[PDB]
Ligand binder design. Structure first.
Ligand SMILES: Nc1ncnc2c1ncn2[C@@H]1O[C@H](COP(=O)(O)OP(=O)(O)OP(=O)(O)OP(=O)(O)OP(=O)(O)OC[C@H]2O[C@@H](n3cnc4c(N)ncnc43)[C@H](O)[C@@H]2O)[C@@H](O)[C@H]1O
Length: 187
């Protein structure tokens, strides 16, 4: 059971991941988490991200692709995993295809741009990430619309070809209601 969660930053993807991990017994592969951990621990693979992330830019495809390939080769990903924050560009999705990483579900969280900003502010006040500042968040959203949002069509086409199942949920609904709409899809 392999699942990709698509959407804009702050769309609620990490919030919903916990429910999905618990129900299907799979770990979450969050490139954002793996990179912040790399920085903290000084790991050779990923410490380089620190400055890119605080700038609200994307990290290079080559670095994030490697981190992910290493994470998913571990035995606890044998029976599936939940990708949260990867693929974030077309080249990253192409690498998965070329490496034979098929996925069973692609789930798109639709949330308007104006809602993201306020959602990330309200959570940036306690998690103290520099990329949750207001102006950085508006840079991340522009990058999102240019580099990441085309994945919606990329994977809508994959599902048409029978390679995955594609669904959209309305992420403006409250947390419990989003959860239940995702269960209608996955169950
Ligand atoms: N693959 C990659 N390639 C290249 N670079 C990469 C990369 N991956 C990472 N990077 C780099 O690393 C940086 C960080 O990326 P990344 O770690 O991915 O940060 P992010 O996931 O984009 O930001 P969030 O974690 O806040 O988004 P979310 O969808 O999880 O929303 P959330 O659930 O938290 O919820 C948000 C807020 O809303 C709340 N909320 C959640 N759901 C709802 C709801 N239904 N209704 C109301 N409020 C809700 C939440 O409580 C919360 O406060 C990137 O900018 C890049 O530099």
């Amino acid at each position: 059971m392999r699942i990709i969660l698509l959407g804009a930053p702050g769309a609620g993807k990490g919030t919903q991941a916990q429910f999905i991990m618990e129900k299907y017994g799979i770990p979450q592969i969050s490139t954002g988490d793996m990179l912040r951990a790399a920085v903290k621990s000084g790991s050779e693979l990923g410490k380089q991200a620190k400055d890119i992330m605080d700038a609200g830019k994307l990290v290079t495809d080559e670095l994030v692709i490697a981190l992910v390939k290493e994470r998913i080769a571990q035995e606890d990903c044998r029976n599936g995993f939940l990708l949260d924050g990867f693929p974030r560009t077309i080249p990253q999705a192409d690498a998965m295809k070329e490496a034979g990483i098929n996925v069973d579900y692609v789930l798109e969280f639709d949330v308007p741009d104006e809602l993201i900003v306020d959602r990330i502010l309200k959570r940036g006040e306690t998690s103290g990430r520099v990329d949750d500042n207001e102006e950085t968040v508006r840079k991340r959203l522009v990058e999102y619309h240019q580099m990441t949002a085309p994945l919606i069509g990329y994977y809508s086409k994959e599902a048409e070809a029978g390679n995955t199942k594609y669904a959209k949920v309305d992420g403006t609904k409250p947390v419990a209601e989003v959860r239940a709409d995702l269960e209608k899809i996955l169950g």
